[PDB]
Amino acid sequence: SAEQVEKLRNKINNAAVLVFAKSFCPYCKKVMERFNNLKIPFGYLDLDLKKNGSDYQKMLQEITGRTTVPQVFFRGEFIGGCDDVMAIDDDTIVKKANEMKYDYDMVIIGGGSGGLALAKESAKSGAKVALLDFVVPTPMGTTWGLGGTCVNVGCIPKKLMHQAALLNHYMEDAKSFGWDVDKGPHDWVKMVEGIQDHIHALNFGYRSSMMNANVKYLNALGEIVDPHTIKTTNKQGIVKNITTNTIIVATGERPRYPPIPGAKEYGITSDDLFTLDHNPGKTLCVGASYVSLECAGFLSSIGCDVTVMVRSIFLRGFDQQMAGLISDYIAKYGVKFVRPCVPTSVRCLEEYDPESGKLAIYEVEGKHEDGTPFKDTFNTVLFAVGRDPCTTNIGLQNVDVKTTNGRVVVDDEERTNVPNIYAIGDVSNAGYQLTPLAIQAGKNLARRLYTADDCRTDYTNVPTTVFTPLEYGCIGLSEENAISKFGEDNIEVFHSYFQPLEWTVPHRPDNTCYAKLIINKQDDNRVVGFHVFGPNAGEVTQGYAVAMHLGARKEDFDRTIGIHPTCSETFTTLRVTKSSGASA
Ligand SMILES: Cc1cc2nc3c(=O)[nH]c(=O)nc-3n(C[C@H](O)[C@H](O)[C@H](O)COP(=O)(O)OP(=O)(O)OC[C@H]3O[C@@H](n4cnc5c(N)ncnc54)[C@H](O)[C@@H]3O)c2cc1C
Numbered sequence: 001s002a003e004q005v006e007k008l009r010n011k012i013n014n015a016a017v018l019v020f021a022k023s024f025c026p027y028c029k030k031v032m033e034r035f036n037n038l039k040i041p042f043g044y045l046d047l048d049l050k051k052n053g054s055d056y057q058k059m060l061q062e063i064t065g066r067t068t069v070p071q072v073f074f075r076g077e078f079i080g081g082c083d084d085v086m087a088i089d090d091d092t093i094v095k096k097a098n099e100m101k102y103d104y105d106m107v108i109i110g111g112g113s114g115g116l117a118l119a120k121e122s123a124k125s126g127a128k129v130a131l132l133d134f135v136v137p138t139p140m141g142t143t144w145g146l147g148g149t150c151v152n153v154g155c156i157p158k159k160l161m162h163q164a165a166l167l168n169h170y171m172e173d174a175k176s177f178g179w180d181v182d183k184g185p186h187d188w189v190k191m192v193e194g195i196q197d198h199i200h201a202l203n204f205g206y207r208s209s210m211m212n213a214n215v216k217y218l219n220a221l222g223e224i225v226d227p228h229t230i231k232t233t234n235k236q237g238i239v240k241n242i243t244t245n246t247i248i249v250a251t252g253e254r255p256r257y258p259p260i261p262g263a264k265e266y267g268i269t270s271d272d273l274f275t276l277d278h279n280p281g282k283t284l285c286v287g288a289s290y291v292s293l294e295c296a297g298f299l300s301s302i303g304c305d306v307t308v309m310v311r312s313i314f315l316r317g318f319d320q321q322m323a324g325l326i327s328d329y330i331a332k333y334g335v336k337f338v339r340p341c342v343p344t345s346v347r348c349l350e351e352y353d354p355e356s357g358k359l360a361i362y363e364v365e366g367k368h369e370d371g372t373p374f375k376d377t378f379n380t381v382l383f384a385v386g387r388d389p390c391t392t393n394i395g396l397q398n399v400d401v402k403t404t405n406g407r408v409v410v411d412d413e414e415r416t417n418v419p420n421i422y423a424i425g426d427v428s429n430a431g432y433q434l435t436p437l438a439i440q441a442g443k444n445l446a447r448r449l450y451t452a453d454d455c456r457t458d459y460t461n462v463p464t465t466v467f468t469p470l471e472y473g474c475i476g477l478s479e480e481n482a483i484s485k486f487g488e489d490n491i492e493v494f495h496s497y498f499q500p501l502e503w504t505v506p507h508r509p510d511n512t513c514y515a516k517l518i519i520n521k522q523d524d525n526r527v528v529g530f531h532v533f534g535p536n537a538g539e540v541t542q543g544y545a546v547a548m549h550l551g552a553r554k555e556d557f558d559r560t561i562g563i564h565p566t567c568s569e570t571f572t573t574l575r576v577t578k579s580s581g582a583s584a
Pocket residue numbers: 109110111112113114115132133134135136147148149150153154155158220221222223250251252253270291390393394424425426427433434435436438
């Protein structure tokens with residue numbers, strides 16, 4: 001109440017056409033059917049499916065002065081109950097439900113994972129919405145279609161290359177299983193065509209979706225001029241201001257290059273790798289982030305001579321034991337590491353020649369800490385250091401939207417310091433930079449803006465997985481972080497090394513695959529961390545995220561019967577602790 005009433009007023013006004021409803025109520029039917037008949041796009045909320053739905057009933061009477069539902073609004077103007085909507089003509093209602101002020105209800109800057117999702121979901125609940133997306137090309141020249149980082153230049157192409165890499169070992173395994181296989185060379189270009197086919201079908205599918213939902217896809221660069229107007233600047237060079245009630249920033253990030261001679265003019269990044277014409281050849285990856293080690297990982301298994309140059313430690317921010325095991329493995333099966341090193345120069349000794357099939361060579365220099373010098377020669381330098389949020393150049397200075405470390409600061413409804421400017425997915429200072437989280441952020445905001453719902457998105461207990469040659473999934477805290485957060489005295493860690501059955505016949509190292517649970521003994525042996533290293537870590541791990549949201553404890557895993565034979569059953573049977581010292 002009081003504070004709550006005003007929160008609902010604010011949603012009603014900033015919505016479009018909006019019907020408060022109930023399942024078992026007859027009249028709400030009538031109104032909605034009429035709105036469908038006149039192509040009037042709206043967005044309902046069934047108070048019956050809420051359980052704080054009572055508050056709403058009473059809150060709405062504060063606002064409108066009417067007792068029952070249905071209760072209709074046209075962008076903040078109360079239109080009335082059922083008998084009120086019917087007294088307005090077939091022509092003049094359609095007119096009334098379009099009175100706008102602004103060109104759009106929502107303009108979305110960026111058509112990535114989050115933008116696209118926010119966009120489709122808001123149009124479903126009646127908003128007139130514009131989606132800006134423009135891919136500023138890479139220093140090298142590269143560009144892609146609609147869909148964002150994941151679709152074009154991340155998750156999708158990344159996991160496909162990985163699968164190509166995983167098959168390499170699967171074929172070596174198949175001889176143990178009785179198959180006579182020789183297997184031949186790997187043609188890089190044939191892979192990249194079928195990858196780039198799939199990305200093109202997704203480019204198309206997303207463009208199609210926006211079109212079928214009445215989202216105006218504008219292929220142009222957005223920039224804020226003030227809280228209700230953005231400046232669009234298109235492929236040609238044109239300019240064109242458009243107005244809007246709500247602005248959503250959703251511009252993602254881009255690869256960071258370090259500040260050294262040759263970085264931009266001779267290196268490449270993830271943006272370029274997935275669309276490369278030729279074999280990358282003898283390749284060097286600079287950085288120990290997830291992008292670097294995944295890329296390194298699948299290039300090596302594809303045949304390439306990979307070297308990874310690490311500044312200090314691997315996967316800063318992930319559990320350092322597990323990072324250890326990721327690197328160790330990667331290293332056992334071919335990836336050469338150079339550590340600690342940062343590169344200092346990139347210089348071009350030779351040219352690439354399509355006339356007539358033969359790769360460029362670059363001399364890279366580095367300081368080997370103490371330091372001896374580093375100097376070696378590669379065909380590809382791949383910078384996989386970090387990624388920078390896309391917040392310079394969008395006019396954030398004009399509205400003074402607050403930032404930190406470059407990320408747009410936001411509250412728990414994804415809103416900035418200026419109350420009609422929201423930000424979602426990677427640019428925000430909420431959460432891990434992941435696609436499903438960009439998506440859900442946006443799906444839920446759509447429902448708050450244009451159905452007046454209170455559903456917020458939960459940024460705790462987020463699962464993640466790194467697709468290294470052997471995969472690492474994790475939820476919750478690292479061991480170090482749980483330790484330092486809850487105290488050494490209050491955490492027990494359960495662990496076990498094990499072997500998938502699928503590896504016993506092919507004689508691949510035993511006790512490499514590994515599982516640990518982090519336990520906060522003080523809070524009823526709550527699971528506060530989950531870590532798995534092995535094949536299909538992503539699958540193994542997804543389901544335990546739900547159990548964690550429901551507050552799983554150790555006894556909750558042990559009462560669960562396992563599935564056999566599976567890698568994931570090991571979590572139902574864990575006994576050895578780290579404090580015991582017993583071998584795992
Ligand atoms: C190599 C790699 C692998 C990854 N793998 C995974 C994975 O396996 N799983 C996972 O969950 N996540 C993964 N991620 C993260 C995931 O890709 C991102 O979390 C997700 O793409 C973010 O979506 P977004 O909508 O916030 O940003 P983006 O998808 O990047 O959306 C931003 C879009 O806006 C455009 N844009 C920027 N500025 C403007 C402007 N001013 N006007 C108009 N348009 C603009 C950009 O060109 C881009 O198309 C990976 C990322 C990388 C780099």
